[PDB]
Design a protein around this ligand. Structure first.
Ligand code: Y01
Ligand code: NA
Lengths: 828, 49, 100, 49
């Protein structure tokens, strides 16, 4: 949009586009030669994204050269994600990337434009109104120094310089000094950095450059320098906001209006500036009007200011009212994560997620409120902000684990794998946040720690800290030596673990040996003995062994025609071994039958009742058919006993090698039985009874290989006998090393934990008797307060980077020249 | 993709942190400030005689 | 650790009457004044007090009468008479066991 | 074995190399030499007036 020039604001901000909540000015002029360094393009591309986040205008020289060409390429590429680049200008080629072009006699409406903008009060009023202006200067020469004085002296826009240029490095080096307003220190410099420029024209304009700099350094509170040693991220935001704050602070009317300077420093991210110049206690504030600033410090994603307002005094359990919490979930809860929650609730349903999905619903519909703000910041992956709200929670061994479940149950939703990936790495540093918070709680009194593991929590998720870890599969928390000691103290029960291993077993046989000092547990010690799950599991093996020796005895000597007294006890003991399975039919959820060995125990009893049905029929055809499906069930009641010994010896590091291998041979024998059906058909289809068919053939083809003309066809038959023995032997050896593929220390201790806690979830009564059946938290606050001090003590290896140890040398080196130039002045 | 490209080309030349953590230029800027002393301290004695 | 009127009063009435020790740290308004005023000699700080004390706390001095602001010179010149009763907890004691 | 013992007890207290490679005392001896300046440079201005 060309406009020839020789007020402007009305036809271009009402008929064309929006307002301008920021306005950056890059003063370069038509310098065709410009070294866009990889640092100089870092400044003027972070600036475009900052201006995109604020919706600014960029006034620059509208020509197709230098930085002004590089600027226009970034505004072209960033109108797809609201910067408007207004350009003001042999003949220079025009930059074909400025959406509104404003073509000596033209750098006077540029000054007339910005002063009309800088005066223009707007009732949004975050910078006291008055539309913040920055003037970025980086070049050298005539028009650069002119554009600083006509900026600074007429009205007040800030100027920002960097350490790369001809005259920008002059003013970058002329701020750590005093030179009587630099009436003779200008020519001391300005030929060291630009010697060719001074010998071009008249001295009366070179004399004027002294005046052009003495009007600049009158106000050094409007000139921020971007040094070279700001060699990190966020250096343009640390320079604009540091410049904009100076022009705000020196209005001499915001001493009462300190609240304007806080929302300015909150619109940007200036923690170190706000903590030193606003929250420094020589100013009078009350810390009760901080509440509308805190509500914007959350929803505008300021995780560093929410820590600042809390450490400056803010009762968060009194700030978090219910209308404040519903302004978060209804307005400031992002719809993408909320639609991610519905898919998280349906396909992976859990008691925790039903509590959270109820919580987001009735907060979007209509107490422990601090445990609801922590949910708000952990759902949307506020990674630095949820670490701050976690530090205020009443019980933090719990809430670090429960948030680790809320992330990991949403880290499996594959709608956005990045958000499901950031939730996975955030939950790992809540596992790690809850490991060391527990080992510090376990390096102290261990009985005091284990009461916290089984706390009722007043229904945070309704679960304890230990049960929240096993459902979330937090392998780092459960494999620590604190919890694995607690299980071994639980599985041995009230018996001490220092007796021996065999010393308990020599007391199961002989009941008078418990009453002696032969067991060293901790009046009627037998109830403590026969309720610890070591002796419960030790009873249900020697009873199960003695079950089989009277199942074998009734199958050889007895079992003539009458179900005698030895079989009636064999009837009811199977029913005793059945009446716990109807309680194993409880707490199953149709997935505890998905281990392929609880079902073989349940199909064992269902194969036994058919032997009872076949028994009391008095005919010899079903009596012998009742003996045979008793004898085949004798194998299954041994394969349960063998599977007991298989697990209970290799319960340890070999529990991940086993039961991954067990499915791998379950797959291999399935591929064997598929091949035996194939080899049966190729045997039935060759030998006789060729067409002699009934439903005989549907049952003979299976069992017939188990009991067991060449014109050119015998040579592929052995090639089949090479191809068939390959693909079965390969599956045999793949089953041999399926455990190998796939932090190996933590993964077996959790699998060791999950099996014993499945057996600790059993009733802790022996087998024949199954038919018969808030000031402790004041101690964890000290362990909590020592830990929160410890995680902010951790800046040792950050401070071993001696860039502040070199900076305190620089303060002591600045102590020299500030105090040594005064030594020479008292001599003359 | 040009913005993702331009953020990346800035990033690969931003990477001089562990090169600049070698403080041989942080010692060199001390040497410039130490050269600021002797260039400006020998002139203190000359105005006394 | 603090700043203001009653903090500087509670040091002089400590030190001058009998001898309890005082311990300051590098975080505060007037505590950082006395933290920075131990590596120096200023003729008992009769004119070096106002060289500081507005750099660290500028709003505090423009509140009341000069005759009590003149007294703050006396309130500090009685403090730095005995620098053997005033230990400073510096920021660069960034480890364990710094209070002991 | 007392000589092999005495060389070893010296050796385990010799081991403060990687502790002393943390140059916080090498910066502290600069601070003593920087405190040597201001203790001896304010007296230069007082003999001129
Ligand atoms: C004389 C005949 C007829 C009876 C033989 C008795 C055994 C069948 C019993 C008595 C001793 C028992 C064992 C005693 C000690 C334990 C250790 C235990 O290993 C664990 O540490 C469990 C994991 C844990 O929670 O720490 C597993 C079961 C086991 C082998 C018991 C399994 C069955 C055993 C061998
Ligand atoms: Na075969």
């Amino acid at each position: 949009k060309y406009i020839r020039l020789s007020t402007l604001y009305d036809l271009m901000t009402q008929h064309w586009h929006l307002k301008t909540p920021n306005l950056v000015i890059s003063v370069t002029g038509g310098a065709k030669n410009f070294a866009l360094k990889p640092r100089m393009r870092k400044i003027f591309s972070r600036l475009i994204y900052i201006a995109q986040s604020k919706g600014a205008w960029i006034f620059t020289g509208g020509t197709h050269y230098g930085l002004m060409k590089y600027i226009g390429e970034v505004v072209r590429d960033n109108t797809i994600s609201n910067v408007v680049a207004i350009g003001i200008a042999p003949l220079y080629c025009l930059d074909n990337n400025h959406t509104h072009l404003l073509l000596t006699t033209e750098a006077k409406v540029r000054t007339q434009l910005e002063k009309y903008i800088s005066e223009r009060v707007i009732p949004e009023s975050n910078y006291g109104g008055k539309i913040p202006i920055v003037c970025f200067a980086q070049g050298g020469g005539k028009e650069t120094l002119k554009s600083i004085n006509v900026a600074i002296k007429s009205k007040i826009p800030c100027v920002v310089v960097e350490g790369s240029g001809r005259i920008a490095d002059v003013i970058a080096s002329l701020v750590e000094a005093e030179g009587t307003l630099a009436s003779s220190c200008v020519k001391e410099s300005l030929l060291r950095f630009l010697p060719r420029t001074i010998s071009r024209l008249s001295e009366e304009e070179t004399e004027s450059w002294i005046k052009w700099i003495k009007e600049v350094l009158e106000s050094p509170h409007l000139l921020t320098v971007i040094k070279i040693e700001e060699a990190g991220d966020e250096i343009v935001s640390n320079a604009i906001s540091f410049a904009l704050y100076k022009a705000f602070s020196t209005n001499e009317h915001d001493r009462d209006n300190w609240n304007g300077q806080l929302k300015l420093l909150l619109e940007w991210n200036q923690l170190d500036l706000a903590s030193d110049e606003i929250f420094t206690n020589d100013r009078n504030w009350e810390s009760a009007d901080l509440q509308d600033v805190m509500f914007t410090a959350l929803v505008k994603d300021r995780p560093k200011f929410v820590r600042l307002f809390l450490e400056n005094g803010l009762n968060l359990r009194k700030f978090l009212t219910t209308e404040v919490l519903r302004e978060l979930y209804t307005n400031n809860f992002s719809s993408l994560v909320f639609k991610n929650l519905q898919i998280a609730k349906n396909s992976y349903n859990d008691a925790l997620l039903t509590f959270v999905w109820k919580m987001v619903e009735d907060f979007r519909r209509g107490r422990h409120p601090l445990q609801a703000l922590f949910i708000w910041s952990v759902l949307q992956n506020k990674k630095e902000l949820s670490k701050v709200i976690w530090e205020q929670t009443r019980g933090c061994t719990l809430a670090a684990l429960g948030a680790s479940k809320l992330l990991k149950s949403m880290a499996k939703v594959k709608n956005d794998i990045n958000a499901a990936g950031e939730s996975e790495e955030l939950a790992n540093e809540y596992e790690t946040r809850a490991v060391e918070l527990f080992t510090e709680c376990y390096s102290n009194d261990e009985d005091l720690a284990e009461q916290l593991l089984t706390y009722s929590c007043e229904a945070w998720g309704g679960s304890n800290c230990l049960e929240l870890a096993v459902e979330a599969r937090d392998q780092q928390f459960i494999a620590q030596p604190g919890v694995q000691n607690f299980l071994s103290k639980q599985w041995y029960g009230e018996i001490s673990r220092d007796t021996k291993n065999w010393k308990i077993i020599m007391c199961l046989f002989f009941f008078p040996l418990i009453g002696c000092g032969f067991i060293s547990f901790r009046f009627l010690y037998y109830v403590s003995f026969f309720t610890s799950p070591f002796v419960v599991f030790s009873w249900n093996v020697i009873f199960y062994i003695a079950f089989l020796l009277l199942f074998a005895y009734v199958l050889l000597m007895d079992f003539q025609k009458e179900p005698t007294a030895l079989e009636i006890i064999l009837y009811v003991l199977v029913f005793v071994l059945l009446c716990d399975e109807v309680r194993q039919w409880y707490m199953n959820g149709s997935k505890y039958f998905s281990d392929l060995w609880n079902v073989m125990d349940t199909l064992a009893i269902f194969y036994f009742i058919a032997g009872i049905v076949f028994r009391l029929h008095s005919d010899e055809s079903s009596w012998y058919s009742g003996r045979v499906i008793f004898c085949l069930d004798y194998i299954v009641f041994t394969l349960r006993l063998i599977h007991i010994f298989t697990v209970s010896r290799n319960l340890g590091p070999k529990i991940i090698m086993l039961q991954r291998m067990m499915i791998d041979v379950f797959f291999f024998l399935f591929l064997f039985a598929v091949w035996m059906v194939a080899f049966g058909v190729a045997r039935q289809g060759i030998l006789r009874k060729n067409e002699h068919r009934w439903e005989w053939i549907f049952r003979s083809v299976i069992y017939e290989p188990y009991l067991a003309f060449p014109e050119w066809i015998t040579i592929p038959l052995v090639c089949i006998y090479m191809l068939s023995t390959n693909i079965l032997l390969v599956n045999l050896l793949v089953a041999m090393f399926g455990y190998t593929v796939g932090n190996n220390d933590q993964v077996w201790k959790f699998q060791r934990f999950f099996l014993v806690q499945e057996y600790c979830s059993r009733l802790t009564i022996p087998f024949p008797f199954v038919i018969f059946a808030n000031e402790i938290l004041a101690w964890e606050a000290v362990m909590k307060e020592n830990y929160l001090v410890k995680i902010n003590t951790k800046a040792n290896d950050s401070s071993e980077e001696m860039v502040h140890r070199f900076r305190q040398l620089d303060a002591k080196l600045s102590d020299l020249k500030g105090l040594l130039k005064e030594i020479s002045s008292k001599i003359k």
